[PDB]
Write a protein that binds this ligand. Structure first.
Ligand SMILES: Cc1cc2nc3c(=O)[nH]c(=O)nc-3n(C[C@H](O)[C@H](O)[C@H](O)COP(=O)(O)O)c2cc1C
Ligand SMILES: Cc1cc2nc3c(=O)[nH]c(=O)nc-3n(C[C@H](O)[C@H](O)[C@H](O)COP(=O)(O)O)c2cc1C
Lengths: 120, 120
């Protein structure tokens, strides 16, 4: 039996590029990525699953935006940021990234959900 | 947002005593227990959440059955065993315990699900 991780996605994220990470593992790796995420970024599942999402950053990504995300994760709060991200072919897009924490019944942090929206 | 852990329970477990444990945490603690489990065993949620399920064992529980469960968990396979368990008031009941592993998309073990059925 494989856990249905998508059973935790909001209504808005259903047809979206979305990823879940596991902050209890070293380096906060992705444990689920939606097909829309893979289509947008140009990766196969094996290329991104189990990796920290920093692979989306590239040479002109703003380092303060990266640190803002890092601090937002440590705060365990809902936050959104516009950040320059890159596909496998090196093309760049402005990503409106929305992150939210997901807790277990005891109240301990369990996952992060991150939804990607290219800014048009 | 609290994860809907019950979104991973089978059809049979829905009205059942069921618990989920997190084997990635030290001592494989419970992270979800159903109300039917709490009613059967006589505990409040705060008394059992975050604890290893060994609190259900008592003075006449068979130590080989306990070790069989331990080995079955290490095998990461589906298994069922009849084991003597105890409620908070010290009364005993034969528990038909069914355990199954739950994996993440990458194929790594994620949770154990355990369903309890008193043998009548
Ligand atoms: C669930 C989740 C989704 C994320 N999605 C993105 C993303 O789409 N683009 C991005 O640049 N960073 C994303 N991140 C952030 C990176 O994984 C990483 O946390 C960020 O680069 C800051 O951490 P670092 O200083 O270790 O790089 C996401 C993080 C999480 C937890
Ligand atoms: C999900 C789950 C449910 C369990 N339910 C029971 C149970 O109902 N009764 C019981 O005696 N042991 C149950 N166990 C087993 C104990 O938690 C523990 O694994 C067992 O006692 C063997 O491990 P130990 O040698 O550390 O005690 C359950 C284990 C898991 C992972």
């Amino acid at each position: 039996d494989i856990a249905d991780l998508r059973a935790l996605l909001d209504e808005d994220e259903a047809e979206m590029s979305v990823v879940f990470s596991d902050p209890s593992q070293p380096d906060n790796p992705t444990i689920y990525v939606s097909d829309a995420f893979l289509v947008q970024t140009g990766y196969t599942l094996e290329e991104v699953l189990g990796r920290n999402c920093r692979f989306l950053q590239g040479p002109d990504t703003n380092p303060h935006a990266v640190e803002a995300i890092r601090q937002g994760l440590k705060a365990e709060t809902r936050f959104t940021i516009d950040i320059l991200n890159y596909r496998k072919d090196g093309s760049a897009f402005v990503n409106r990234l929305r992150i939210r924490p997901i807790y277990d019944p005891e109240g301990n942090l369990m996952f992060f959900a991150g939804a990607q929206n290219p800014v048009l």
